[PDB]
Design a protein around this ligand. Structure first.
Ligand SMILES: Cc1cc2nc3c(=O)[nH]c(=O)nc-3n(C[C@H](O)[C@H](O)[C@H](O)COP(=O)(O)OP(=O)(O)OC[C@H]3O[C@@H](n4cnc5c(N)ncnc54)[C@H](O)[C@@H]3O)c2cc1C
Ligand SMILES: O=C(O)[C@@H]1CCCO1
Length: 459
C-alpha cells in the first residue's frame, strides 16, 4: 500500500494519451489576456533571436554576380571602377567518431576541471546569471566507477561552495548530480541495494552542500528510475541534519504522463518535511530512447507523450501547479523555447520577486535567448534570473551528454531547430500549444491521439 499521492503516480504511469492530454488541456490553457501578452513577448524574443545580425533582413536582399560586385568594390578608385563597367575498418571509424564528438561537444562544455569552470563564472554572474555545475559522467558500470564519481562530486562541492562564499542557494552557484553515477548498474538496481549503498552517498553529498549553503539538484534520467528516485528523495527530506534547509533540488520531466502526479506528491512532501523544494521543470532529454525502450518492452503504452506539442501542454499545466504553491516550491523553469519562457513569465503574474522562480538553460544553447531576459529593464531586459547548467569534464566524460544534445538540436520538432529555419514564420514558431492541440483534435476526430507514426508497442 502506497500513500494516496504515490499510488496515483503509479496509476498514471502509461495512461492512454487521449486521456492524459484531455485532462491536461484546461489546466494548461492560458486565459485570453494572458495568452495574448505571452504571444506578443514570445514573438519579440524570437524575432530578436533570429534577426540578431540581420539574418532575415538579409534574406530580403545570384552568388555569381556578388563575387563580381565584390571584386569591383576592391578597385580603389571609383572612376576606374565605373570605366571598367562601361568599357581502415574498425579503428578508423572509431577515431572519426571520437573526434567529431569533441568538435561538436566543446560548445556544450564550460570547462575540463571545476576550478576552470568556476574561474570563468564572473562574466555572466555579474550580469545576473547563476550556475549549476555538473561533473560530466553517468551510468557507472562498476563499484570503482561509482566511487570515482562520488569523489569528483565531493571535490566539486568543496570548490563550488568555497566560490559561493555564503551567497546561498538562490543567488549562489549550485551543483547537479546524476544518481546513475553513484551506484553501479543503477539501471537495474533493486530497492534494497540502492538504499543500502546509493542513499548514504546521496545523504553525504547533500549534508556537504548544506555546509556550504549551495543548492544540490538531482537530475532526472530514464523513466524506469523515477520511482526509486522518489524513495531516495523522501528519505533525504526527513534527515535531521537537513531540517530547515531548502537547498535540496529535484528535476521533474513534463514529457512523462506521471509529471502532474509527481507534483502532487512533491507538494505533500514539502509540507510533511517542512521545507521549500527547489524543483526544476523540464520537458526531458531521453525521449528517443524512451520510445525505443517501450517499443521493446511490449507494454500497454508509453510513459512519455508521442507528439511534441503534448509535452508542451504538459509543461504549461505543470508550471501552473508549481507557481500556485510558492511556500512549498521554488520553480526553476528550464527551457530554450521562447513561447514557453513567455508563457511562464506571464503565468507567474504581477509582482515578481527574485525568490519566486528562476529560468534555467544549458550552456551553449540558451545564452542568446536569455541575454534578452536576465539583466536590467533599462537595458531592455526582463530582469528575470537564469541559472546555466554547466557541464564540466574532459573528452572521456562527454559522449552521452553530447548525443542527447545532438538529438535535441537536430530534431525538426525542436524550437532551437525551427527558429533557425528562415522559412517557418515567427507566428507558427511561437504558436500556442493548447490551440495547436485543439486544432489537431478538430482535424483528427479526438483530442490527444498519439503520433500517427508511433503506434502502441503491441500494434
Ligand atoms: C537547465 C536544464 C536542465 C535540464 N535537466 C534535465 C534533466 O535533469 N533530465 C532531463 O531528462 N532533461 C533535462 N533537461 C531538458 C532537456 O535537456 C532539453 O533541454 C529540453 O527537453 C528541451 O526543452 P525546450 O523547452 O528547450 O525545447 P522544445 O523544443 O520546446 O521542446 C523539446 C522537447 O520536447 C520533447 N519531445 C520531442 N519530441 C517529442 C515528441 N515527439 N513527443 C513528446 N515529446 C517530445 C523532448 O523533451 C524534447 O527535449 C534540462 C534542460 C535544461 C535547460
Ligand atoms: O544530461 C542531460 O541531458 C540533461 C540536461 C542536463 C541534466 O540532464
Amino acid at each position: 500500500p502506497q500513500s494516496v499521492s504515490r499510488a496515483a503516480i503509479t496509476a498514471a504511469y502509461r495512461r492512454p494519451e487521449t486521456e492524459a492530454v484531455s485532462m491536461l488541456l484546461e489546466q494548461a490553457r492560458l486565459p485570453q489576456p494572458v495568452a495574448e501578452q505571452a504571444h506578443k513577448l514570445a514573438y519579440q524574443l524570437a524575432d530578436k533571436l533570429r534577426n540578431q545580425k540581420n539574418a532575415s533582413g538579409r534574406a530580403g536582399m545570384g552568388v555569381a554576380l556578388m563575387c563580381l560586385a565584390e571584386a569591383l568594390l576592391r578597385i580603389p578608385d571609383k572612376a576606374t571602377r565605373d570605366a571598367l563597367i562601361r568599357d581502415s575498418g574498425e579503428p578508423l571509424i572509431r577515431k572519426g567518431v571520437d573526434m567529431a564528438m569533441r568538435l561538436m561537444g566543446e560548445q556544450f562544455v564550460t570547462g575540463e576541471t571545476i576550478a576552470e569552470a568556476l574561474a570563468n563564472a564572473r562574466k555572466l554572474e555579474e550580469k545576473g546569471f547563476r550556475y549549476s555545475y555538473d561533473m560530466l559522467g553517468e551510468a557507472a558500470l562498476t563499484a570503482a566507477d561509482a566511487q570515482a564519481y562520488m569523489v569528483s562530486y565531493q571535490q566539486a562541492i568543496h570548490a563550488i561552495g568555497k566560490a559561493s562564499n555564503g551567497r546561498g542557494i538562490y543567488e549562489g552557484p549550485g551543483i547537479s548530480i546524476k544518481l546513475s553515477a553513484l551506484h553501479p548498474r543503477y539501471s537495474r538496481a533493486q530497492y534494497d541495494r540502492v538504499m543500502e549503498e546509493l542513499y548514504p552517498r546521496l545523504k553525504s553529498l547533500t549534508l556537504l552542500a548544506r555546509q556550504y549553503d549551495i543548492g544540490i539538484n538531482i537530475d532526472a534520467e530514464e523513466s524506469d528510475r523515477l520511482e526509486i528516485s522518489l524513495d531516495l528523495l523522501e528519505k533525504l527530506c526527513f534527515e535531521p541534519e537537513l531540517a530547515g534547509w531548502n537547498g535540496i533540488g529535484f528535476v521533474i520531466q513534463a514529457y512523462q504522463k506521471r509529471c502532474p502526479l509527481v507534483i502532487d506528491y512533491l507538494i505533500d512532501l514539502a509540507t510533511r518535511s517542512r521545507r521549500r523544494l527547489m524543483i526544476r521543470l523540464v520537458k526531458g532529454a531521453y525521449w528517443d530512447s524512451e520510445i525505443k525502450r517501450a517499443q521493446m518492452d511490449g507494454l500497454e503504452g508509453y510513459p512519455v507523450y508521442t507528439r511534441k506539442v503534448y509535452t508542451d501542454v504538459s509543461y504549461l499545466a505543470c508550471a501552473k501547479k508549481l507557481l500556485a504553491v510558492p511556500n512549498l516550491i521554488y520553480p526553476q523553469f528550464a527551457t530554450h523555447n521562447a513561447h514557453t519562457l513567455a508563457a511562464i513569465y506571464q503565468l507567474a503574474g504581477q509582482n515578481y520577486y527574485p525568490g519566486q522562480y528562476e529560468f534555467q538553460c544549458l550552456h551553449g544553447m540558451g545564452e542568446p535567448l536569455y541575454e534578452q531576459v536576465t539583466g536590467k529593464v533599462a537595458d531592455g531586459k526582463l530582469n528575470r534570473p537564469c541559472r546555466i547548467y554547466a557541464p564540466v569534464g574532459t573528452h572521456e566524460t562527454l559522449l552521452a551528454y553530447l548525443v542527447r544534445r545532438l538529438l535535441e538540436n537536430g530534431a525538426n520538432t525542436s524550437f532551437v531547430n525551427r527558429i533557425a529555419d528562415t522559412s517557418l514564420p515567427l507566428d507558427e514558431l511561437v504558436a500556442d500549444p493548447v490551440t495547436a492541440v485543439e486544432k489537431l483534435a478538430q482535424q483528427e476526430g479526438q483530442t490527444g491521439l498519439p503520433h500517427p507514426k508511433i503506434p502502441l508497442p503491441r500494434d
